Coordinates of C-alpha atoms in Angstrom, one line a residue:
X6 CA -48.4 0.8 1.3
X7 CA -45.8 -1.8 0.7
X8 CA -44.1 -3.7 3.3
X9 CA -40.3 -4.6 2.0
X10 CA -37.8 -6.2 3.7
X11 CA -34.0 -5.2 3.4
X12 CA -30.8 -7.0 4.4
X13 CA -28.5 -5.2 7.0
X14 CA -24.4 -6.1 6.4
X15 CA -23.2 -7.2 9.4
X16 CA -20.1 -5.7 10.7
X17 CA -16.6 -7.5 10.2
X18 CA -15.0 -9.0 12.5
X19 CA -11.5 -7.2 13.9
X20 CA -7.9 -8.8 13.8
X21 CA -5.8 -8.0 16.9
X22 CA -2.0 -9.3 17.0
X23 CA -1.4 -11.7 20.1
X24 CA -0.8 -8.1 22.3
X25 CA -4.6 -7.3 21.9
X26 CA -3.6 -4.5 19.4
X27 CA -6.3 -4.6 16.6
X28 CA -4.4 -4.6 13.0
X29 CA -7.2 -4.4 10.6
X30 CA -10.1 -1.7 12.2
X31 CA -13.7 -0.8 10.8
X32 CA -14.0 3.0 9.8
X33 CA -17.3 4.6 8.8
X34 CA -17.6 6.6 5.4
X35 CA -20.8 8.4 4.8
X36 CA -22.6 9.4 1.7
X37 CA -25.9 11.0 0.2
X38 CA -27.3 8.9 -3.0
X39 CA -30.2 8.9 -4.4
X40 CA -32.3 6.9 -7.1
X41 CA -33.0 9.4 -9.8
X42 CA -36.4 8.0 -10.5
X43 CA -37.4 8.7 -7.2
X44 CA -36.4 12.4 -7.3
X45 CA -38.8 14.4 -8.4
X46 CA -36.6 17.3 -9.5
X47 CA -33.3 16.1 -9.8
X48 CA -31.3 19.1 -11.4
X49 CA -33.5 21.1 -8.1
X50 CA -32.7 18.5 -6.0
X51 CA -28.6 19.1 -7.0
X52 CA -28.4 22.3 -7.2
X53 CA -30.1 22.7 -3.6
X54 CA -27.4 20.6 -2.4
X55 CA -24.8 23.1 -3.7
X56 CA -25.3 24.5 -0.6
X57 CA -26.0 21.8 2.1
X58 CA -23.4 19.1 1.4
X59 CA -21.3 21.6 -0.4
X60 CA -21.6 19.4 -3.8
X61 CA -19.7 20.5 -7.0
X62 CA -19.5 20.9 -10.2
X63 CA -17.0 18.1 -10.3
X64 CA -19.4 16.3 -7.6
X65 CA -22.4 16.5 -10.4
X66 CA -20.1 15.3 -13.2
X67 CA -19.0 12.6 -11.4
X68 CA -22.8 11.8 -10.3
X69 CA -23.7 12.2 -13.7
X70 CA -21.4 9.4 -15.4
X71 CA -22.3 7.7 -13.1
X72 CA -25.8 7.7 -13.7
X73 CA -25.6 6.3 -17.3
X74 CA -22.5 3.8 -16.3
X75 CA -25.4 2.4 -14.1
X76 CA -29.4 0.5 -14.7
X77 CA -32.2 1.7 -14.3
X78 CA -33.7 2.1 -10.0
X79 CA -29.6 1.6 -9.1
X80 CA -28.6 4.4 -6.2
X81 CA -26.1 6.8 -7.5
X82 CA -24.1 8.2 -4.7
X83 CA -23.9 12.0 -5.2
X84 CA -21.5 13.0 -2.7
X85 CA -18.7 10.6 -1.3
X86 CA -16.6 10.9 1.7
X87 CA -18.8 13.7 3.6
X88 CA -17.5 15.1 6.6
X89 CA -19.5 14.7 9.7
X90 CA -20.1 18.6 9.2
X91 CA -21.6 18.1 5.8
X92 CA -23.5 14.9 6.8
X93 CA -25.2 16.5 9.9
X94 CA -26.0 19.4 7.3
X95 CA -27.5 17.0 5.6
X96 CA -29.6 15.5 8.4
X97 CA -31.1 19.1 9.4
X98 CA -32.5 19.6 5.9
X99 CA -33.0 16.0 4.9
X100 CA -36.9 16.8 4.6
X101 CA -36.2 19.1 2.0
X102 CA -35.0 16.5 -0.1
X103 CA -37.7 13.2 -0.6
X104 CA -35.3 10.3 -2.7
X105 CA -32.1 11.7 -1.3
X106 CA -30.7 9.2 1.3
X107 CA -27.8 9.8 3.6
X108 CA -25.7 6.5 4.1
X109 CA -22.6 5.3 6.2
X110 CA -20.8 2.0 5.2
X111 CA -18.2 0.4 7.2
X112 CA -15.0 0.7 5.2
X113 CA -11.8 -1.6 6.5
X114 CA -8.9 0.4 7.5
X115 CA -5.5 -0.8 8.1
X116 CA -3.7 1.3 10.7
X117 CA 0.3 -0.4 10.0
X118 CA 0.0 -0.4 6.2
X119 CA 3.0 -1.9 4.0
X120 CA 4.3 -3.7 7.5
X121 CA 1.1 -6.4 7.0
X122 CA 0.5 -6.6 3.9
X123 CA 1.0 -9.9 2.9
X124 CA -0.2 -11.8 6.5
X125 CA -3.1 -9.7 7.0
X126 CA -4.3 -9.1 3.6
X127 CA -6.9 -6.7 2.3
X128 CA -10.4 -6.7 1.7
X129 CA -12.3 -4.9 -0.9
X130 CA -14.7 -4.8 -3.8
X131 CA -16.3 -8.3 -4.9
X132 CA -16.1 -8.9 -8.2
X133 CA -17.8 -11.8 -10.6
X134 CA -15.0 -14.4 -9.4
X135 CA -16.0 -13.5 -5.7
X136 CA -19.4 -14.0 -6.8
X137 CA -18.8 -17.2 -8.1
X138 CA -16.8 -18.4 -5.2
X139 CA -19.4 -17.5 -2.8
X140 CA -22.2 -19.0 -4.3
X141 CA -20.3 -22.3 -5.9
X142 CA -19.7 -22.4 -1.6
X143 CA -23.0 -21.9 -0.6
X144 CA -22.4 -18.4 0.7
X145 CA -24.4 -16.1 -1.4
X146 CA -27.1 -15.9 0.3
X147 CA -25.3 -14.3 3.8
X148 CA -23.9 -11.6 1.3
X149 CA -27.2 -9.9 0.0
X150 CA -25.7 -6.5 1.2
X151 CA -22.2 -7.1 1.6
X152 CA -20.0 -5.6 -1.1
X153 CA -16.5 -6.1 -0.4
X154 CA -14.5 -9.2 0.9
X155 CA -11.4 -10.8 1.9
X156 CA -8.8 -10.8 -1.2
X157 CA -5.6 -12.4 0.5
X158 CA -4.1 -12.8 4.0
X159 CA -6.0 -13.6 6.8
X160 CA -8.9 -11.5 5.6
X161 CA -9.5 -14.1 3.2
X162 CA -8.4 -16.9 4.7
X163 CA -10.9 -16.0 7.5
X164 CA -13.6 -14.5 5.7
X165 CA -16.3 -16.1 6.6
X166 CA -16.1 -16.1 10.6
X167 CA -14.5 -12.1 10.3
X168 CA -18.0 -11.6 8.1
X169 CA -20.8 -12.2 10.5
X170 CA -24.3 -13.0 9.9
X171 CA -26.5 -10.8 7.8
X172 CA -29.9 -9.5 9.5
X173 CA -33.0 -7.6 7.9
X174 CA -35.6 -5.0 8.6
X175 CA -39.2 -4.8 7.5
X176 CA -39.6 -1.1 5.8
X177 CA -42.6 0.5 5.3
X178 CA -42.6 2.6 1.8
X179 CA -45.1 4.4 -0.4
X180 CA -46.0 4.8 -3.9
X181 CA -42.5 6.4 -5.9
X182 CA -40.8 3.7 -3.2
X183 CA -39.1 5.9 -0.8
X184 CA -38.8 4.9 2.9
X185 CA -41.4 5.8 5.9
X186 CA -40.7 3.9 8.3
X187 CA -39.0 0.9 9.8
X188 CA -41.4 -2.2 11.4
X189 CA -39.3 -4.7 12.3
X190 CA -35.4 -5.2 12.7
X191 CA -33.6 -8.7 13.2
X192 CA -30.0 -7.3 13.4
X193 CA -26.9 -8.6 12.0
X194 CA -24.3 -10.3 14.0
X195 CA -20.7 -9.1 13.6
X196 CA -18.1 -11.4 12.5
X197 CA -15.5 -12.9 14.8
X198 CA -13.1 -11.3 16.4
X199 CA -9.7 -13.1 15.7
X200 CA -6.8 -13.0 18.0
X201 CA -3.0 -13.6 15.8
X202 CA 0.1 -15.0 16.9
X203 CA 1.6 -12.2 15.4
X204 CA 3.7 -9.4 17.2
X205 CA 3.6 -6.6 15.4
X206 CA 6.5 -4.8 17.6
X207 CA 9.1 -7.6 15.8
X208 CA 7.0 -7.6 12.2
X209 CA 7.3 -3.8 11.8
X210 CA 11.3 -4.2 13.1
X211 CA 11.8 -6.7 10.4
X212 CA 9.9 -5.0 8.2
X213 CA 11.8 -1.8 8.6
X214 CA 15.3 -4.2 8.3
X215 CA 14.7 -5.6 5.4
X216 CA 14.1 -2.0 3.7
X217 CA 14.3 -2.1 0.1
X218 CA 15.3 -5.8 0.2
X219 CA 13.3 -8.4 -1.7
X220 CA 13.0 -11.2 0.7
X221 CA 11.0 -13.2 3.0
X222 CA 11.2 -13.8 7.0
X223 CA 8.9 -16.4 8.9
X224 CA 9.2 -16.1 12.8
X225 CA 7.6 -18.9 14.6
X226 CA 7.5 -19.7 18.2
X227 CA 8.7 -23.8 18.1
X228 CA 7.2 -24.5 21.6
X229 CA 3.9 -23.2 19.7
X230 CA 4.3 -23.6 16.2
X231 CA 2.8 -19.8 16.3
X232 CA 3.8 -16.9 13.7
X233 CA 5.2 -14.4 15.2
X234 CA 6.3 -12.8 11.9
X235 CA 5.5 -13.1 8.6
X236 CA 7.6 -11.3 6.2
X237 CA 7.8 -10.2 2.5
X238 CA 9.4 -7.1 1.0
X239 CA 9.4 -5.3 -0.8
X240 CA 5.3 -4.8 0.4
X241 CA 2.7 -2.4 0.1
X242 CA -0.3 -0.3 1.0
X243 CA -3.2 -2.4 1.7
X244 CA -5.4 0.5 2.0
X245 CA -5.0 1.3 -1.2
X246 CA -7.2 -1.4 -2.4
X247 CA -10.1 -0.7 0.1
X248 CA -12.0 1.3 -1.7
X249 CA -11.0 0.6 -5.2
X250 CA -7.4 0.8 -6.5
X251 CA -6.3 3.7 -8.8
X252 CA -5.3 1.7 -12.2
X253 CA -2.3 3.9 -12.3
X254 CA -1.2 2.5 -8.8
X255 CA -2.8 -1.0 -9.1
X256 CA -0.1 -1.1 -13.2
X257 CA 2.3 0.2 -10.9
X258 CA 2.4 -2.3 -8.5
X259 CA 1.9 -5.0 -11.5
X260 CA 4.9 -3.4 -13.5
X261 CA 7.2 -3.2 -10.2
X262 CA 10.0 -5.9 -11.3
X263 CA 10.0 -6.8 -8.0
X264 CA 6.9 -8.1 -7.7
X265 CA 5.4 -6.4 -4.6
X266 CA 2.2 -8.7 -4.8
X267 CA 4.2 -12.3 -4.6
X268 CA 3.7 -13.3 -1.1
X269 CA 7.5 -14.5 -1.1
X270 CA 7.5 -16.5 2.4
X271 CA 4.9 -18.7 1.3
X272 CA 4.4 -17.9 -2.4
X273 CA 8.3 -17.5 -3.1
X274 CA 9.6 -20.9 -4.8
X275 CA 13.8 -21.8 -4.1
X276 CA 16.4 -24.3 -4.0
X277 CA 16.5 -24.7 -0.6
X278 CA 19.9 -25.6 -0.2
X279 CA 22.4 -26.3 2.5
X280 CA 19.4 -25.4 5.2
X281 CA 18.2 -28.8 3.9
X282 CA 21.0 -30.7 5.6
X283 CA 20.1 -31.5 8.9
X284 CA 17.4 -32.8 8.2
X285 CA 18.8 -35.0 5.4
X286 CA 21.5 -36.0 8.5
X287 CA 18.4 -36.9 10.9
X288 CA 16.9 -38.8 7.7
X289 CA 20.2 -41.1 7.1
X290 CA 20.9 -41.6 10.7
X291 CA 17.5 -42.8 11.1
X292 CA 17.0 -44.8 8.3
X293 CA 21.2 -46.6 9.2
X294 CA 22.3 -44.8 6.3
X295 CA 24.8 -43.3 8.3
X296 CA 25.9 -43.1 12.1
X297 CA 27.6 -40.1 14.3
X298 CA 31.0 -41.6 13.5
X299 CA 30.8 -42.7 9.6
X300 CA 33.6 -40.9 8.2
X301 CA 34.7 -40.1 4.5
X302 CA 37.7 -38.4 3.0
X303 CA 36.7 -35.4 1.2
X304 CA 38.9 -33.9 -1.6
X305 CA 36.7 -31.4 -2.9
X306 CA 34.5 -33.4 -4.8
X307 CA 32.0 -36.3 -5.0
X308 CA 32.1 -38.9 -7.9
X309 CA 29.1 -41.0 -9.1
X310 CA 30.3 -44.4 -8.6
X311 CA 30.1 -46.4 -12.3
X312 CA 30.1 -43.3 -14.1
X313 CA 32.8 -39.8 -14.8
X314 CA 30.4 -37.4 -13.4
X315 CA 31.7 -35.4 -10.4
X316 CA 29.5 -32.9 -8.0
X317 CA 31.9 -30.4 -6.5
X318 CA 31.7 -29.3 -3.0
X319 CA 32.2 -25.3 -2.4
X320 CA 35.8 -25.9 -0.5
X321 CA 38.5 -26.8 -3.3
X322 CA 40.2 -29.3 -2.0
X323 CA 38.3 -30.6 0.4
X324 CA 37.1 -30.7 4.5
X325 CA 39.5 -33.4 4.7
X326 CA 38.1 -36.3 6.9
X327 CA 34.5 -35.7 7.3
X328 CA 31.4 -37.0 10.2
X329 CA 28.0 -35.8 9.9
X330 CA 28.8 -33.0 13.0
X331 CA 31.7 -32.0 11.2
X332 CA 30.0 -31.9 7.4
X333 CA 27.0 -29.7 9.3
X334 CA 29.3 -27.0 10.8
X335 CA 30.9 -26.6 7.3
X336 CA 28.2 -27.0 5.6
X337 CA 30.1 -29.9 3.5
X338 CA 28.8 -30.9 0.3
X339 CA 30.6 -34.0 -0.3
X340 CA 29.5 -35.4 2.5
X341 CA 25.6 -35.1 1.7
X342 CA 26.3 -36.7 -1.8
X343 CA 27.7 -39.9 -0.5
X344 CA 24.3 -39.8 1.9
X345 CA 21.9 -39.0 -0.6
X346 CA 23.4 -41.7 -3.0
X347 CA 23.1 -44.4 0.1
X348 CA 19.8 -43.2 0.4
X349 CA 18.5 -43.4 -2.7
X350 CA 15.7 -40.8 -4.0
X351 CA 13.0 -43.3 -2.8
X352 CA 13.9 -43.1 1.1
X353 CA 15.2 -39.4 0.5
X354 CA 12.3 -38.0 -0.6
X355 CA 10.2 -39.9 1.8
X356 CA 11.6 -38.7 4.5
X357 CA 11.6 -35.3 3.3
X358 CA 8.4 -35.8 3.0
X359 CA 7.8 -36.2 6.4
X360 CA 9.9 -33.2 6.8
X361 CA 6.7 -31.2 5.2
X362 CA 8.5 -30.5 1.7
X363 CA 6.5 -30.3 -1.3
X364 CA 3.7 -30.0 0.7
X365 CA 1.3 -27.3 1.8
X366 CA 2.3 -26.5 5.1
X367 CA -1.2 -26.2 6.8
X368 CA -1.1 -22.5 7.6
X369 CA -4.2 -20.4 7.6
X370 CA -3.1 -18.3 4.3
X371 CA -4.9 -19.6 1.3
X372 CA -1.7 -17.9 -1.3
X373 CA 0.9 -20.6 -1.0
X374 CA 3.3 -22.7 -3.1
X375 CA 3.8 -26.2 -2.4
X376 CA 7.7 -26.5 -4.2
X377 CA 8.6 -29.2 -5.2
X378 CA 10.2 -32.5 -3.3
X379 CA 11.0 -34.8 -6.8
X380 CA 10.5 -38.1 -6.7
X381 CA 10.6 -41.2 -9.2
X382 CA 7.0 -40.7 -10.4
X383 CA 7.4 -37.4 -10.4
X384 CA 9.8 -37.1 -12.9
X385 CA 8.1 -39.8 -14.9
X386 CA 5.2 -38.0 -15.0
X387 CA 6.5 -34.9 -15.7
X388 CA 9.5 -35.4 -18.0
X389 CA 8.9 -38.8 -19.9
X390 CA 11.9 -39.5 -18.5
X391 CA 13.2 -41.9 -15.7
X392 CA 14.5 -41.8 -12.8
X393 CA 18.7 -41.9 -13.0
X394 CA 20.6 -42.0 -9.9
X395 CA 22.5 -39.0 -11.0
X396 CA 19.8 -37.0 -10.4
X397 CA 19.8 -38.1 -6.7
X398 CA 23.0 -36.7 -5.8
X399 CA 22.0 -32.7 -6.0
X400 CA 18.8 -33.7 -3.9
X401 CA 21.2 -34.2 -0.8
X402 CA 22.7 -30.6 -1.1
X403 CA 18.7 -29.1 -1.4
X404 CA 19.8 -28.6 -5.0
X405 CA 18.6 -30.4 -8.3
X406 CA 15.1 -30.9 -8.6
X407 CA 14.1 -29.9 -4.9
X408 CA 12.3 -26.7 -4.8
X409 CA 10.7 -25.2 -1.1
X410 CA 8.9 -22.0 0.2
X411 CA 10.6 -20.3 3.3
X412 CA 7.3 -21.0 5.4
X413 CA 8.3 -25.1 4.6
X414 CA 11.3 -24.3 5.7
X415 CA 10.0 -23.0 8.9
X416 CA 7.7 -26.1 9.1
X417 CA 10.6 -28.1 9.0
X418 CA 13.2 -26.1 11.0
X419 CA 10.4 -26.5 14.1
X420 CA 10.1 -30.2 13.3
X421 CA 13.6 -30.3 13.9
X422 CA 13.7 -28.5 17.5
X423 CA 10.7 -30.5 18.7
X424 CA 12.9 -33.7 17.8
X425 CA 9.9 -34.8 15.5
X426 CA 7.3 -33.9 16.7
X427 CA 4.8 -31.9 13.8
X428 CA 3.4 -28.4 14.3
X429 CA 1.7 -26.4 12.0
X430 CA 2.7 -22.7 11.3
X431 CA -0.3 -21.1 12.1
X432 CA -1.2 -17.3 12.6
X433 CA -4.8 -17.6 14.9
X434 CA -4.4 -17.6 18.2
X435 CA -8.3 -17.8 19.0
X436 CA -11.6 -16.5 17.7
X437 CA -13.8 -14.5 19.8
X438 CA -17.1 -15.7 18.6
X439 CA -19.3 -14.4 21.1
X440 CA -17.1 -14.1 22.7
X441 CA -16.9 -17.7 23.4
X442 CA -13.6 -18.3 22.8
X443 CA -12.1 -20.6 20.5
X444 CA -8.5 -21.5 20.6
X445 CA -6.9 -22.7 17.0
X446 CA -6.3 -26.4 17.2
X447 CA -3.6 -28.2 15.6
X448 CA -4.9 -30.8 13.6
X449 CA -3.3 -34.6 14.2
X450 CA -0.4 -34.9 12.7
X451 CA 1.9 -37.6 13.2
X452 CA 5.4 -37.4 14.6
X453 CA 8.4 -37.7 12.1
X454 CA 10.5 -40.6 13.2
X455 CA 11.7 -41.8 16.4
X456 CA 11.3 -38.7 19.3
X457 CA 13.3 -41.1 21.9
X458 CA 16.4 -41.4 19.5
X459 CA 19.8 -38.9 19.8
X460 CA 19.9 -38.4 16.2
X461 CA 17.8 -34.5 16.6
X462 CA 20.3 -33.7 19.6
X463 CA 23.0 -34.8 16.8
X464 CA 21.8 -32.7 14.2
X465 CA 21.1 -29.8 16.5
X466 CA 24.9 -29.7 17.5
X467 CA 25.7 -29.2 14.1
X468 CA 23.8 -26.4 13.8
X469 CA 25.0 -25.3 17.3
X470 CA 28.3 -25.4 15.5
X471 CA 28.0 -23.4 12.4
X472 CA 27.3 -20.4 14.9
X473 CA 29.4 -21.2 17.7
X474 CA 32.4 -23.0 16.4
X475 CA 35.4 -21.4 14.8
X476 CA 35.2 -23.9 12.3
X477 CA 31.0 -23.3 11.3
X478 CA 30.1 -21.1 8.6
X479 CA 28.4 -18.9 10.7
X480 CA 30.3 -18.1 13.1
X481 CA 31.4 -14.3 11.8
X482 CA 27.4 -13.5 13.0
X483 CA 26.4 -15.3 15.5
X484 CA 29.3 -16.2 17.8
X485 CA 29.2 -13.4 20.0
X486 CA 25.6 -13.7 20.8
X487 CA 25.2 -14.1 24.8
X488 CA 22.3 -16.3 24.2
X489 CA 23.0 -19.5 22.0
X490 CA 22.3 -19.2 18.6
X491 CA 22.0 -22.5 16.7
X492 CA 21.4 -21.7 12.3
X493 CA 22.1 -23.4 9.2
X494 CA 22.7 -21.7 6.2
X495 CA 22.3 -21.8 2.3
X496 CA 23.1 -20.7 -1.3
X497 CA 20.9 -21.2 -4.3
X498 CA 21.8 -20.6 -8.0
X518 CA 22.9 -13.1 -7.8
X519 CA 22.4 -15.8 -5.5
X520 CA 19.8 -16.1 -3.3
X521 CA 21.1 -15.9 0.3
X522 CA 19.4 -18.4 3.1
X523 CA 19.5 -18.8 6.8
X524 CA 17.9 -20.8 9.0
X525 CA 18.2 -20.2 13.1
X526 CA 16.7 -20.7 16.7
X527 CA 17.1 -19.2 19.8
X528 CA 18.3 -20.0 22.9
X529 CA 20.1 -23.2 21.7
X530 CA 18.6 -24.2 25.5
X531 CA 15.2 -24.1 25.1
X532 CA 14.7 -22.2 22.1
X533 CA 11.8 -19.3 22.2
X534 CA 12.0 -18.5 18.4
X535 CA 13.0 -20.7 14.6
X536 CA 13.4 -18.1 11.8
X537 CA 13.2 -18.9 8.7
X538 CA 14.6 -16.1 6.1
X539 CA 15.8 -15.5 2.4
X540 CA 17.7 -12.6 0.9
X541 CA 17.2 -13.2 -2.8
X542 CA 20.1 -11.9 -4.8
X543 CA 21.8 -11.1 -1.4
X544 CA 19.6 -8.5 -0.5
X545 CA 20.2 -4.6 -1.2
X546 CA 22.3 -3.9 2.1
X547 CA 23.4 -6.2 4.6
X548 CA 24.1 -10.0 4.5
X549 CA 21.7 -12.4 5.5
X550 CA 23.7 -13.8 8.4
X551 CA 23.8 -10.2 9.8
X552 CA 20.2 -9.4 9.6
X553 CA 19.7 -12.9 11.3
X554 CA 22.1 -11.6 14.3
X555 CA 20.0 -8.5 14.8
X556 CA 16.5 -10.0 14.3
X557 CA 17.9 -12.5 16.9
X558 CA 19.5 -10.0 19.4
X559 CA 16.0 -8.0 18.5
X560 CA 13.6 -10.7 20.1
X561 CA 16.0 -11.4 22.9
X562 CA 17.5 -8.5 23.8

């Protein structure tokens, strides 16, 4: 008798949000399957099980497709889903039935649906690219009897500590192969527990806000750099993919014009516009470009000095006489294209730079954009084309050539509350391990500029102003707030509608950075910022 030995999946890890509730859960689904081969009778075998498992016609049918779809010594289920009734059936007549093997895997379940989908991800079937990617990494070998995986989110991001480590047993089996007895077990360990910044109390509220919206929300704590909310609509059933997606459901989510699978707070590309200017303020301040009381007259519009072209600024005729604090509150245009001209792209773009755009963030989702931060070799290598200063001027309004992702504005919306100083948006709290736990660590990042200047308390103010000041755009939403509310706003190319915001202007708890695109199908994106606000606060 033959001595075999058989891998044993580990169990995956579980995903809690930062209250401890788990988000992404482990359910058992049992099945009978059996190799054919090793049947003696199969058609006996079947038709005995009309009555213990309650199998079909349509259960046969099924089994028998199968069976050709499938190679030779391959286990063909023969009954799917059983119910614990049918399965302990099963069990009391199992010795009636040599080759027939009752089987329970672990199937992911995902208890909030549509309100995760994009943060948390989904994990299901491998496929040959999974193959590849496992075993171009090393990892096939720890996936002998795993069969589905991490396909986006934090599943896959996290994969391989939610996975654990596959174990064995030695089996005992006879001649036909069928099972006798167990010898020997070295179990699995289960993956990782991992512990989120996320609340899922504020991402099922936004969630439910944004309602058939497409947009994007990212909700970090600044003091942290933690996620609190991760945001894109309009979403979608993860559990739909778990065990296999229909084709009809998997074309309709493919053919849904607004693209429920982009990922649109760090996937979704945009002009980030105005939101861009206080840190383009901090930028010329720093580099002497400008100081809190460099003044211009503004008319309504910007010319390029030594040439005709002018760049319009949204008021008509003009803010009239024009600081930094003052261009920030009103969100001035002009203003910004004299800077960004003084700056030239060189400095701009290095300095946005430091800001994070046109780079990956560092956040633990592997599905993200980088956008775009142009620069002189850039456009070089891209276009053929030089550099000409005329394409500077739009750069200082987050128009032209810039491009960002709503989770780089968060990146740099925090780098602007921590005067400088660089954290990571990052969902994981800590991994359990053992549980040994491991907190996330923020990798060394140095600071942007000078933390011991007043040029981020400068900027700030501004900001502070377009929600508090009767003069700042934003004051029609966030005024009234007992709290402070400091926010800077933004248009790109309907028009995609941007805000920007943190909370208390004090010591702000929470930076939100969020995108209507097209306006969004209700409200206005100032007025969903108010009540996300007044949401966290209370």
């Amino acid at each position: 008798n033959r001595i075999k030995l058989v891998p044993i999946a580990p169990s995956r890890g579980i995903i809690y949000d930062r209250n401890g509730i788990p988000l992404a859960l482990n359910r058992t689904i049992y099945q009978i399957e059996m190799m054919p081969e090793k049947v003696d009778n199969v058609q006996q075998t079947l038709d005995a099980l009309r009555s213990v498992v309650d199998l079909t016609d349509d259960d046969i049918a099924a089994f028998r497709k199968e069976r050709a779809r499938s190679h030779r010594f391959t286990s063909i289920p023969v009954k799917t889903n059983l119910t614990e009734v049918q399965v302990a059936r099963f069990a009391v007549n199992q010795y009636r039935f040599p080759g027939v093997e009752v089987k329970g895997y672990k199937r992911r379940y995902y208890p909030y649906g549509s309100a995760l989908t994009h943060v948390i991800g989904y994990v299901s079937k491998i496929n040959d690219k999974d193959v590849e990617r496992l075993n171009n990494d090393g990892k096939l070998a720890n996936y002998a009897a795993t069969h589905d995986i991490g396909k986006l989110g934090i599943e896959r991001y996290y994969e391989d500590v939610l996975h654990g480590q596959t174990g064995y047993e030695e089996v005992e089996v006879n001649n036909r192969g069928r099972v006798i007895r167990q010898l020997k077990e070295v179990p699995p360990q289960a993956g990782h527990d991992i512990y989120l910044t996320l609340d899922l109390k504020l991402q099922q509220y936004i969630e439910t806000l944004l309602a058939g919206s497409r947009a994007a929300v990212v909700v970090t704590d600044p003091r942290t750099g933690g996620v609190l909310a991760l945001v894109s609509t309009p979403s979608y059933d993860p559990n739909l993919f778990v065990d296999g997606i229909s084709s009809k459901d998997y074309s309709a989510l493919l053919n849904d014009p607004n693209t429920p699978l982009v990922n649109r707070a760090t996937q979704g590309v945009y002009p980030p516009a105005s939101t861009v200017k206080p840190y383009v303020a901090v930028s010329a301040l720093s580099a002497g470009v400008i100081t809190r009381n460099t003044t211009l007259f503004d008319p309504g519009w910007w010319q390029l000095p030594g040439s005709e072209k002018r760049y319009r600024d949204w008021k008509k005729w003009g803010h009239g006489r024009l600081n930094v604090t003052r261009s920030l509150e009103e969100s001035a245009d002009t203003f910004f294209y004299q800077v960004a001209y003084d700056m030239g792209i060189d400095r701009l773009s290095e300095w946005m730079g430091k800001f994070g755009y046109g780079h990956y963030t560092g956040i633990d989702l592997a599905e993200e954009r980088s956008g775009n931060m142009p620069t002189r070799e850039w456009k070089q290598k891209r276009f053929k084309k030089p550099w000409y200063q005329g394409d500077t001027i739009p750069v200082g309004i987050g128009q032209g050539y810039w491009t960002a992702t709503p989770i780089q504005m968060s990146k740099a919306l925090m780098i602007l509350i921590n005067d400088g100083i660089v954290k990571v948006p990052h969902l994981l709290m800590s991994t359990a391990e053992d549980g040994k736990q491991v907190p996330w660590v923020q990798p060394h990042e140095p600071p942007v500029g000078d933390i011991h200047s007043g040029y981020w308390e400068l900027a700030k103010d501004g900001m502070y102003g377009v929600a508090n000041r009767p003069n700042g755009t934003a004051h029609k939403y966030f005024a009234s707030a007992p709290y402070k509310i400091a926010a800077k706003s933004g248009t790109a190319q309907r028009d995609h509608k941007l805000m920007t915001a943190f909370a208390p202007y004090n010591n702000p708890q929470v930076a939100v950075a969020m995108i209507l695109e097209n306006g969004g199908a209700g409200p206005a994106v100032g007025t969903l910022m108010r009540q996300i606000l007044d949401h966290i606060m209370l």
